[PDB]
Amino acid sequence: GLFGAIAGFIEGGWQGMVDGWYGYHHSNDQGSGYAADKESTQKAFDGITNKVNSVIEKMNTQFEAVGKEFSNLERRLENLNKKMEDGFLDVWTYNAELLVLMENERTLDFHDSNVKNLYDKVRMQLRDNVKELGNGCFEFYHKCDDECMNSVKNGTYDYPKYEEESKLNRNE
Amino acid sequence: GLFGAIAGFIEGGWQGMVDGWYGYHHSNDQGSGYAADKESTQKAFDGITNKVNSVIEKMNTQFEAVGKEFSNLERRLENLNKKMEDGFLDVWTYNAELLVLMENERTLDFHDSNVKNLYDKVRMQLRDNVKELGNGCFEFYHKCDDECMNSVKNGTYDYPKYEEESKLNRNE
Amino acid sequence: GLFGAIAGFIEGGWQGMVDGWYGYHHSNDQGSGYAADKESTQKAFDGITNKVNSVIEKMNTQFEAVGKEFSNLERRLENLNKKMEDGFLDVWTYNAELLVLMENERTLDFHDSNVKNLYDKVRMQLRDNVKELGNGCFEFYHKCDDECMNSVKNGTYDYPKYEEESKLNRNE
Amino acid sequence: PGDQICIGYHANNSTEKVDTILERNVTVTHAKDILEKTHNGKLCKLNGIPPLELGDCSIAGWLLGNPECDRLLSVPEWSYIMEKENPRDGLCYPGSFNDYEELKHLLSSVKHFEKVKILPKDRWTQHTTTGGSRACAVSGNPSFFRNMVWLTEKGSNYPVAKGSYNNTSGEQMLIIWGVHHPNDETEQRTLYQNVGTYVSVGTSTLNKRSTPEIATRPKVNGQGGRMEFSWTLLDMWDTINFESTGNLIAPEYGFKISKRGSSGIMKTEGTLENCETKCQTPLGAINTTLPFHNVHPLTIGECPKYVKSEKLVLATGLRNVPQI
Amino acid sequence: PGDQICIGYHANNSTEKVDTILERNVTVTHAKDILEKTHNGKLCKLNGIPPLELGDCSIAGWLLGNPECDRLLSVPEWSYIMEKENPRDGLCYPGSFNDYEELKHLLSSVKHFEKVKILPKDRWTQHTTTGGSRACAVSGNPSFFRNMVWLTEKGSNYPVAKGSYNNTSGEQMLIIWGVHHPNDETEQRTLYQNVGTYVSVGTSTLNKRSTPEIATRPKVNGQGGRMEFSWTLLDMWDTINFESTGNLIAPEYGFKISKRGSSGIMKTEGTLENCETKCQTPLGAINTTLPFHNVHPLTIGECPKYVKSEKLVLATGLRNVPQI
Amino acid sequence: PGDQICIGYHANNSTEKVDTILERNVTVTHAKDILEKTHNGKLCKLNGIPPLELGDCSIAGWLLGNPECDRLLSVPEWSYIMEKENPRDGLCYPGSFNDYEELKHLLSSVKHFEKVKILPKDRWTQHTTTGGSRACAVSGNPSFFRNMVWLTEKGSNYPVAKGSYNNTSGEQMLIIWGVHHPNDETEQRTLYQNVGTYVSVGTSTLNKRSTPEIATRPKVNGQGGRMEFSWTLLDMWDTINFESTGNLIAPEYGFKISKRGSSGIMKTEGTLENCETKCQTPLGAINTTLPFHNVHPLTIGECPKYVKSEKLVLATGLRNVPQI
Ligand SMILES: *[C@@H]1O[C@H](CO)[C@@H](O[C@@H]2O[C@H](CO)[C@@H](O)[C@H](O)[C@H]2NC(C)=O)[C@H](O)[C@H]1NC(C)=O
Ligand SMILES: *[C@@H]1O[C@H](CO)[C@@H](O[C@@H]2O[C@H](CO)[C@@H](O)[C@H](O)[C@H]2NC(C)=O)[C@H](O)[C@H]1NC(C)=O
Ligand SMILES: *[C@@H]1O[C@H](CO)[C@@H](O[C@@H]2O[C@H](CO)[C@@H](O)[C@H](O)[C@H]2NC(C)=O)[C@H](O)[C@H]1NC(C)=O
Ligand SMILES: *[C@@H]1O[C@H](CO)[C@@H](O[C@@H]2O[C@H](CO)[C@@H](O)[C@H](O)[C@H]2NC(C)=O)[C@H](O)[C@H]1NC(C)=O
Ligand SMILES: *[C@@H]1O[C@H](CO)[C@@H](O[C@@H]2O[C@H](CO)[C@@H](O)[C@H](O)[C@H]2NC(C)=O)[C@H](O)[C@H]1NC(C)=O
Ligand SMILES: *[C@@H]1O[C@H](CO)[C@@H](O[C@@H]2O[C@H](CO)[C@@H](O)[C@H](O)[C@H]2NC(C)=O)[C@H](O)[C@H]1NC(C)=O
Ligand SMILES: *[C@@H]1O[C@H](CO)[C@@H](O)[C@H](O)[C@H]1NC(C)=O
Ligand SMILES: *[C@@H]1O[C@H](CO)[C@@H](O)[C@H](O)[C@H]1NC(C)=O
Ligand SMILES: *[C@@H]1O[C@H](CO)[C@@H](O)[C@H](O)[C@H]1NC(C)=O
Incomplete structure (x- = not known):
């Protein structure tokens, strides 16, 4: 996809992550497990809700056919009426189908962007205190217990705190 | 946003940068200050100008209502005329409103891309002669005076020139 | 462009790469040369084919003018017919022209994304076994013969295999 | 080999499909069908009348x-x-x-x-x-x-x-x-x-x-x-x-x-049947919260908007990608 | 701690708002209103006639x-x-x-x-x-x-x-x-x-x-x-x-x-007033360079294009983001 | 200085141009003209009749x-x-x-x-x-x-x-x-x-x-x-x-x-000439596989769709960028 994360450098999705669209899998001495990122999921959920409403709302004063009848001496007028009502029908079917395609495209890319941005947020916070494995995972140069993992996941990871220990381990 | 820079890893905007959309804040021994990036700002300004003209121009042979009158024995024809003129009105109101939404979306993302691309351009030029702080800032491993800062800002930063000094300082 | 690769950090295109849209130029002891990336080119080719068909297909029940005649005492009806047929003509000309602009925009950005994603795929696989020069090129810290180059190009580069040799050379 | 953290995305058992400009028949984790295709086959009272x-x-x-x-x-x-x-x-x-x-x-x-x-x-x-x-x-x-x-x-x-x-x-x-x-x-x-x-x-x-x-x-x-x-x-x-x-x-x-x-x-x-509706078509009555329908263009009442479409499905979730 | 350079973007005092597909009520640094909503309430000569x-x-x-x-x-x-x-x-x-x-x-x-x-x-x-x-x-x-x-x-x-x-x-x-x-x-x-x-x-x-x-x-x-x-x-x-x-x-x-x-x-x-216009509506004359208007659909002269919209505002600048 | 690998993209001699919302007159490596502009200037039999x-x-x-x-x-x-x-x-x-x-x-x-x-x-x-x-x-x-x-x-x-x-x-x-x-x-x-x-x-x-x-x-x-x-x-x-x-x-x-x-x-x-067509206009017959034409709105036969456009060209390739 456009942002290269979904079905990209993160090769597959997680059946085990059931409480949101995007998030984490962590592995340490204490154990391993999945957790959704609440903030990015909520942000995407609100965007998507707004999108569906917007697409629906723009086709609310859409054309309506109105039944009329015509004599055998009013065939041109009958045809005009038919071409008009059918013409608008075709325009609005076009508006609906095109809009749904164009927006579906952008929806899938939006999720891709959201995953990429989440990855990059974590990456830009962890810096060289970790190895980038290239598959969506980071390997730590310092032990990162459950509280440490929680700080990464809520965006309050303390680089300076682990800077000393990580650089010694990276180099030894 | 889509590219993760605006209201993203660069968390806020600059009231102090008044002469363009994107640019720099530098800090050294000589002092500190803001400066717009002329090239990327101009490029965006021309794109945006073209966009507004394009949206306007595509609705130039847009439908016009034409006043007509009908007898009390021409109510079907009157209704046909009304449904037609109103039908086109609704189509063109749709075209206008949809277009403005879709393009507003893309405009905001365009600026986001432009900031991201500017950051990455600088990043890819500075390489390991700097630390990436994760907030839009780079911290230099060599002293970077006003002329040095100007070379970064006009895309003519000389990596080989500072390569030796930076690597010694990064390691000591 | 939106993704910053085409006419971006990769400053120019390759006249010498004739068998695909995106790919590689390699340089080693054995020689140098161009090669298209089959997988990313094919993926883009199929997307683009689908796009052109989709744009064409959405304007298939587009309006058709139907020749009718009117008396000198049916000027309102004549005008209604004309405004209708011209009105639909203008709507469909709009649909066609707008669609082609919006999609051309996205097509050029799609190619840009595809180049960026290819670069990043290679980058994320090579890791610190190479230097990122900032121009689309990577310089290797280990000798990379023709078979090595082929593994990079088909996505099966073995980082662990060269990890030891590269890190010694980067540091010496 | 040390402790790790990984970034990822949701997958599930969904077989729901959507189209885009660039790609057809895409499986997504979540989707919203916005097109009513059904009616009750009856002529009914309209709001009780x-x-x-x-x-x-x-x-x-x-x-x-x-x-x-x-x-x-x-x-x-x-x-x-x-x-x-x-x-x-x-x-x-x-x-x-x-x-x-x-x-x-x-x-x-x-x-x-x-x-x-x-x-x-x-x-x-x-x-x-x-x-x-x-x-x-x-x-x-x-x-x-x-x-x-x-x-x-x-x-x-x-x-x-x-x-x-x-x-x-x-x-x-x-x-x-x-x-x-x-x-x-x-x-x-x-x-x-x-x-x-x-x-x-x-x-x-x-x-x-x-x-x-x-x-x-x-x-x-x-x-x-x-x-x-x-x-x-x-x-x-x-x-x-x-x-x-x-x-x-x-x-x-x-x-x-x-x-x-x-x-x-x-x-x-x-002929009229003993049924109630807010939206009557010549083929039958519609009862839906969906914004569009494809039943018939000549409707009476408070109706969804008619389109000729066979399908209108909006992606809401992401591309549903097979596990590793 | 050494010398630094930072990349950033413009913010200002703008309260101008725009909508997108994805988000409503977005404050931007610069915007262009493309909809004329005003008229002079008078019937006028049209190009002097x-x-x-x-x-x-x-x-x-x-x-x-x-x-x-x-x-x-x-x-x-x-x-x-x-x-x-x-x-x-x-x-x-x-x-x-x-x-x-x-x-x-x-x-x-x-x-x-x-x-x-x-x-x-x-x-x-x-x-x-x-x-x-x-x-x-x-x-x-x-x-x-x-x-x-x-x-x-x-x-x-x-x-x-x-x-x-x-x-x-x-x-x-x-x-x-x-x-x-x-x-x-x-x-x-x-x-x-x-x-x-x-x-x-x-x-x-x-x-x-x-x-x-x-x-x-x-x-x-x-x-x-x-x-x-x-x-x-x-x-x-x-x-x-x-x-x-x-x-x-x-x-x-x-x-x-x-x-x-x-x-x-x-x-x-x-009744006719002593005024001049290039664009007359039944409600009054329009004098604008804007491409659209919402005054009345029945206009005579060189007029902007009529739409039913209450607002048409194009973003030109970027998302206006509170300082740090 | 060691062995190198570089990522890049195709350029060629193409002078084909396309427009986008953001930019006009863009040279691309490949493009598809989807608008028929020509006809034969003759009135013809339509499918042999x-x-x-x-x-x-x-x-x-x-x-x-x-x-x-x-x-x-x-x-x-x-x-x-x-x-x-x-x-x-x-x-x-x-x-x-x-x-x-x-x-x-x-x-x-x-x-x-x-x-x-x-x-x-x-x-x-x-x-x-x-x-x-x-x-x-x-x-x-x-x-x-x-x-x-x-x-x-x-x-x-x-x-x-x-x-x-x-x-x-x-x-x-x-x-x-x-x-x-x-x-x-x-x-x-x-x-x-x-x-x-x-x-x-x-x-x-x-x-x-x-x-x-x-x-x-x-x-x-x-x-x-x-x-x-x-x-x-x-x-x-x-x-x-x-x-x-x-x-x-x-x-x-x-x-x-x-x-x-x-x-x-x-x-x-x-007057009728000795020619055959599937699509007749008053100006002449059209013979094309293209989906659109701009010849005349009143056509008879199996025809492309008429638009007023002077040009309709879809980009298929990428921005054609001068070599280094
Ligand atoms: C006009 O001619 C018809 C055909 O000869 C007459 O007779 C019948 O008309 C029906 C109408 O449905 C035809 O389908 C049949 O072929 C005829 N039936 C038979 C066997 O008589 C019709 O009566 C004639 N009109 C008048 C006024 O005499
Ligand atoms: C981000 O996560 C960290 C790590 O869990 C949070 O710090 C803990 O907060 C909870 C609730 O108060 C308690 O377990 C402890 O007080 C903290 N951890 C320990 C054991 O020291 C922190 O609250 C979170 N910060 C934000 C901004 O949400
Ligand atoms: C038809 O009947 C009306 C009502 O009786 C006659 O008288 C008036 O018509 C006006 C018309 O506006 C009515 O509104 C009033 O109710 C009547 N006014 C009064 C008090 O006479 C009308 O004159 C009758 N037409 C003829 C031809 O005689
Ligand atoms: C990019 O910026 C550098 C650094 O300022 C420029 O080099 C200086 O150019 C100005 C104008 O000629 C003078 O101050 C000096 O000649 C240069 N600096 C010094 C003191 O050596 C350079 O001209 C810029 N390059 C481009 C391509 O625009
Ligand atoms: C009505 O008047 C005209 C003009 O005097 C008569 O004569 C000619 O009509 C033609 C029509 O094309 C005019 O263009 C010419 O100016 C006239 N030609 C000449 C020199 O006679 C016309 O004949 C009159 N109608 C009747 C019934 O007598
Ligand atoms: C990726 O490329 C590598 C490197 O060329 C391939 O390995 C070679 O495969 C070919 C065909 O079988 C032969 O030259 C050798 O068997 C391999 N190289 C040598 C000399 O050892 C590999 O097949 C490719 N892998 C994939 C998944 O396509
Ligand atoms: C859609 O994709 C599925 C597999 O995901 C496949 O079984 C089916 O053939 C496809 N349907 C169409 C319309 O081609
Ligand atoms: C728009 O946003 C502003 C704050 O930025 C707020 O004061 C106002 O309530 C919002 N208006 C609407 C239409 O909700
Ligand atoms: C289009 O661009 C070419 C150069 O690429 C230039 O020669 C020509 O003037 C341009 N045409 C238009 C329509 O401005």
Whole structure:
């Protein structure tokens, strides 16, 4: 996809992550497990809700056919009426189908962007205190217990705190 | 946003940068200050100008209502005329409103891309002669005076020139 | 462009790469040369084919003018017919022209994304076994013969295999 | 090898598919179908108000009072009108109805009439009013449209027939009248005595007249003669004057417009069922919260918007990608 | 801690908001409103050319010459025509005007007439031409439409009335005529002497005729009679022949089309003010460089495009993000 | 300095340009023009079936049988009809054709007629049928529309003329008739003997009549008289009855609809050439696989979709960027 994360450098999705669209899998001495990122999921959920409403709302004063009848001496007028009502029908079917395609495209890319941005947020916070494995995972140069993992996941990871220990381990 | 820079890893905007959309804040021994990036700002300004003209121009042979009158024995024809003129009105109101939404979306993302691309351009030029702080800032491993800062800002930063000094300082 | 690769950090295109849209130029002891990336080119080719068909297909029940005649005492009806047929003509000309602009925009950005994603795929696989020069090129810290180059190009580069040799050379 | 953290995305068992400009048939984790494709196959009350079911009667058959349409002589407020494609019971005495489609269009904004006896038949004291035709037979004897009066000779005379009505009813009133075009001179003489007759109708705005046409025509329902009907909407406080030397088919009644609003004539061969809806189509009723439907373009009520689409599905979730 | 360089973006005090598909109410640094919502509330000259202000006259009142419309007997070129919704001064002698809306539509492409005296009244040497009605009274005496001639009996005779005009004027010419439908036989005899009359009109392409209808009708402006007017556009070098045995209301004039172009009839109760515009609506004039407006769909001049929108604002700048 | 690998993209010699929302005149490596702008400048057979070329004849000239149109007396199936803007050969005896545009519209769904001699002229045994006019002269002698019969006095008498035809032909049948409106009384007497005549036509659904109008009119093709034509589509198994005391212009033939389908009248001054097409425009034929064209909006056949665009070019390749 456009942002290269979904079905990209993160090769597959997680059946085990059931409480949101995007998030984490962590592995340490204490154990391993999945957790959704609440903030990015909520942000995407609100965007998507707004999108569906917007697409629906723009086709609310859409054309309506109105039944009329015509004599055998009013065939041109009958045809005009038919071409008009059918013409608008075709325009609005076009508006609906095109809009749904164009927006579906952008929806899938939006999720891709959201995953990429989440990855990059974590990456830009962890810096060289970790190895980038290239598959969506980071390997730590310092032990990162459950509280440490929680700080990464809520965006309050303390680089300076682990800077000393990580650089010694990276180099030894 | 889509590219993760605006209201993203660069968390806020600059009231102090008044002469363009994107640019720099530098800090050294000589002092500190803001400066717009002329090239990327101009490029965006021309794109945006073209966009507004394009949206306007595509609705130039847009439908016009034409006043007509009908007898009390021409109510079907009157209704046909009304449904037609109103039908086109609704189509063109749709075209206008949809277009403005879709393009507003893309405009905001365009600026986001432009900031991201500017950051990455600088990043890819500075390489390991700097630390990436994760907030839009780079911290230099060599002293970077006003002329040095100007070379970064006009895309003519000389990596080989500072390569030796930076690597010694990064390691000591 | 939106993704910053085409006419971006990769400053120019390759006249010498004739068998695909995106790919590689390699340089080693054995020689140098161009090669298209089959997988990313094919993926883009199929997307683009689908796009052109989709744009064409959405304007298939587009309006058709139907020749009718009117008396000198049916000027309102004549005008209604004309405004209708011209009105639909203008709507469909709009649909066609707008669609082609919006999609051309996205097509050029799609190619840009595809180049960026290819670069990043290679980058994320090579890791610190190479230097990122900032121009689309990577310089290797280990000798990379023709078979090595082929593994990079088909996505099966073995980082662990060269990890030891590269890190010694980067540091010496 | 140390502790790790990984970034990823949701997958599930979803088989829901969507299209984009760039790619067709994409499986997504979540999707929203926005197109109603179903209906109940029934004609229903619309917000509790039943349609007027004409059965085998046409609009003309109803308003003229074709004797086959007597169930319709007094009808309550309706939400829409059901008319068959080719109703059997219309002009039982054959003829034509001027501006008939304009009259049907008027009905798309009318939800009730009050039938008012504006020209009581007993007041035609100088003319015979019991005239009828085998074309309109009831129980094997000649009869006639219930709402109309066929004036003929009395005592072998037909004096100028004059009737007038001032619309004091409080609303605009639909009034229908006719002219009889006989087959032959025998008919004209035996019915009217006079020759070279006319029927004149006049309000403040309408002045329409007729000279009856005697002429041989193919028989329709047994008759070579024809009755040509016309109509007007008589404004509040306006007067209609009928004047004729022969061949006038006079109204006895007018239809006062007693309720106005969005309505319509639905073309259907079906019959009303004991069901309720907010949205009626000719194929059946729709009950949905979805914004679009593809059932039929001619709907009555509070309906979704019609599109020709076979499918309209919005992606909401992400690309559903096979686990590793 | 060393020297630093940072990448960033502009923020300001802007409170300008825009919508997108994905998000509503977004504050941006810069924006462009592309929708004109204002007008001056006045009816104005259009590019320096004033409209034809009919006042209390209808189009029919003007062209027939209703005496209440005498200010309109000669009018200069106009840019549009202002007509009230229900003008008081139309057919002062009551009646009808055939193809009236077609005539009004013709006026949307005409910017001036030259009124030409095609059938001077003094040439009707065998008929009386001073006939008038209290329905058209002026200063308490009977009068008549100024542009028309009511031919009546002279010396107790009405011979066949024949007039003809060859259009040598250099442009197509609008010509109006009428037939009088009397209330009663007294009227017919006292006015025309003859019975069973007709009015025939013939050009190279038109052959329209009438037999006058005597009939009792509600009085309108005091009169149970009616005048039924018809019209034609007489081509260059074509001839019109009038022939009648009674009941002809002849034109004295024709209206030569002397200027053509985009015009129109604006429905308004208002009056012309001393103002100038390039774009007139029924609510007032627009003066804007913006591409769209939402003022009214019926505009005349060089106007922006009308949309129903309440707002159309394009983002030009970026998301305006609170400082750190 | 070590071994290197570089990522890049294709460039070539392409000068193909495209537009986007954001940027105009962009050179791309590959592009697809989706707009056909060319045609062959010829009128052609459509899928092997030639059009009906009317030449100098109008639709009325053909169907009435104007003698200048005799090449058209029997014509095979057509794919479209070519008619000039102002055909010379129409109503040679001047007049009018009621509902003429409705008749032309009918022709857009008809691809062939079989002309059937429904009322053979020899059966008018009580009337003269050889009547003609200098307006319709052939070889310097009076003649008449080939498909019509001008009934006049015989032995100085004109009895009631009655003809009837039951449509047993197997399809709906177009039938045309006329009424002669003379210039003067001499004409009426010398042609018909009778005065105060009428023409009546009646089917199961149509009852149309006429009283001929005697009146002085400008001469057209030498004649101040007029013939007013009317038409009907006679249903299968229905009967048409003509009845007249004078002035009837009777059909001798009816046009049975023998092939139906999508057709149309193309307005053109041109002539058929020996060429084949699937898509005909008034400017010339189109032969293309492209989805759009801008040649002309009025096309007949299997055509691309018409747009007003000057260009429609889709980018398929990438931005074509100058080498380093
Ligand atoms: C981000 O996560 C960290 C790590 O879990 C949070 O710090 C803990 O907060 C909870 C609730 O108060 C408690 O377990 C402890 O007080 C903290 N951890 C320990 C054991 O020291 C922190 O609250 C989060 N911060 C934000 C901004 O949400
Ligand atoms: C990019 O910026 C550098 C650094 O300022 C420029 O080099 C200076 O150019 C100006 C104007 O000529 C003078 O101050 C000096 O000649 C240069 N700096 C010094 C003091 O050595 C350079 O011109 C810029 N390059 C481009 C391509 O725009
Ligand atoms: C990716 O490329 C590598 C490197 O060329 C491929 O390995 C070679 O495969 C070819 C064909 O079988 C032969 O030259 C050798 O068997 C391999 N190289 C040598 C000399 O050892 C590999 O097949 C490719 N892998 C994939 C998944 O496509
Ligand atoms: C028809 O009936 C009305 C009502 O009785 C007659 O009288 C007035 O008409 C006006 C019209 O606006 C009504 O609103 C009033 O109710 C009536 N006013 C009064 C008090 O007389 C009208 O005159 C009748 N028409 C004829 C021809 O006599
Ligand atoms: C009506 O007037 C015209 C102009 O005087 C008459 O004569 C010609 O008509 C043609 C038509 O094309 C004009 O263009 C010419 O100016 C005239 N030619 C000449 C020199 O005679 C026309 O004949 C008149 N109509 C009748 C019935 O007499
Ligand atoms: C007109 O001709 C038809 C056919 O000969 C007459 O007879 C029947 O008409 C029906 C109408 O549905 C046809 O389908 C049948 O072929 C005929 N049935 C039979 C066997 O008689 C019809 O009666 C004729 N009209 C008149 C007025 O006599
Ligand atoms: C859609 O994709 C599925 C597999 O995901 C496949 O079974 C099916 O054939 C596809 N349907 C269409 C419309 O091609
Ligand atoms: C728009 O946002 C502003 C704050 O930025 C807020 O004051 C206002 O309530 C919002 N308006 C709407 C339309 O919700
Ligand atoms: C399009 O661009 C080319 C250069 O790439 C230039 O020669 C030409 O002037 C441009 N055409 C237009 C329409 O401006």
